[PDB]
């Protein structure tokens, strides 16, 4: 048996709706920070929102408001949480994806329990047949 580790795509560790929900939530929080300061930029907010989660070099400015610092630090916390979760889940799945057992021996369940899906035989009229 040639070993092979299964992985459907980048989508194997994460549920499909997770990416959509996080992508909409980050946009919503960026809009929330953007709107409520004037009554006393969106592109910069968008770049922070995307890149900071993605750990990119994009983004060179700083948010204008004060509680934006708290929002940015909690967003960095969210980013480290999500990246650590992806890494840990991928590692755990890549460790626990080894193929099934290779027949323990005479006491093997697939041998102790006959199954039409697992057919085994030997040479007729031989010492093993007598045994």
């Amino acid at each position: 048996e040639i070993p092979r580790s299964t992985l459907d795509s980048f989508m194997q560790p994460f549920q499909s709706t997770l990416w959509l929900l996080v992508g909409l939530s980050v946009h919503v929080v960026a809009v929330m920070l953007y709107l409520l300061d004037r009554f006393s930029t969106l592109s910069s907010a968008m770049w922070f929102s995307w890149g900071v989660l993605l750990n990119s070099g994009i983004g060179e400015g700083a948010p204008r408001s004060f509680s934006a610092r708290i929002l940015g630090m909690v967003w960095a916390g969210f980013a480290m949480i999500i990246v650590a979760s992806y890494t840990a889940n991928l590692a755990a799945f890549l460790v626990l994806d080894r193929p099934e057992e290779r027949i323990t021996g005479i006491n093997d369940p697939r041998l102790r329990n006959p199954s039409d899906k697992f057919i085994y035989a030997t040479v007729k009229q031989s010492s093993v047949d007598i045994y």
């Binding site: 580790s5 027949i103 021996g105 045994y131």
Partner: protein
């Protein structure tokens, strides 16, 4: 010999291959004595080395099955979509500079 098939499990029913002969054959005692002498002097060792231990192809200590093409090949697919955004460049003007 081929490295396409593998033994598995733990050996059971330990027996010994033997030269059988008719019960009244007078050769029994000397056959047994000669076979023991061959075991002792190491001739059996030479015959085993020259006919059992070829080991021209050996496989052992199975690897943890490193990554391959297909298990994240689809990842590459996504970057193709990025190229699509590129051909949007001109319409960017129509998207932004007009508005």
């Amino acid at each position: 010999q081929k490295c396409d098939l593998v033994t598995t499990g733990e050996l059971f029913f330990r027996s010994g291959f033997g030269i059988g002969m008719r019960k009244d054959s007078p050769w029994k005692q000397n056959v047994s004595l000669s076979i023991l002498k061959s075991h002792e002097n190491g001739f059996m060792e030479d015959l085993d080395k020259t006919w059992v231990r070829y080991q021209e192809c050996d496989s052992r200590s199975n690897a943890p099955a490193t990554l391959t093409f297909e298990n994240m090949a689809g990842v590459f697919m996504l970057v193709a979509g990025g190229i699509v955004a590129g051909i949007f460049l001109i319409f960017i003007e129509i998207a932004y500079k007009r508005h």
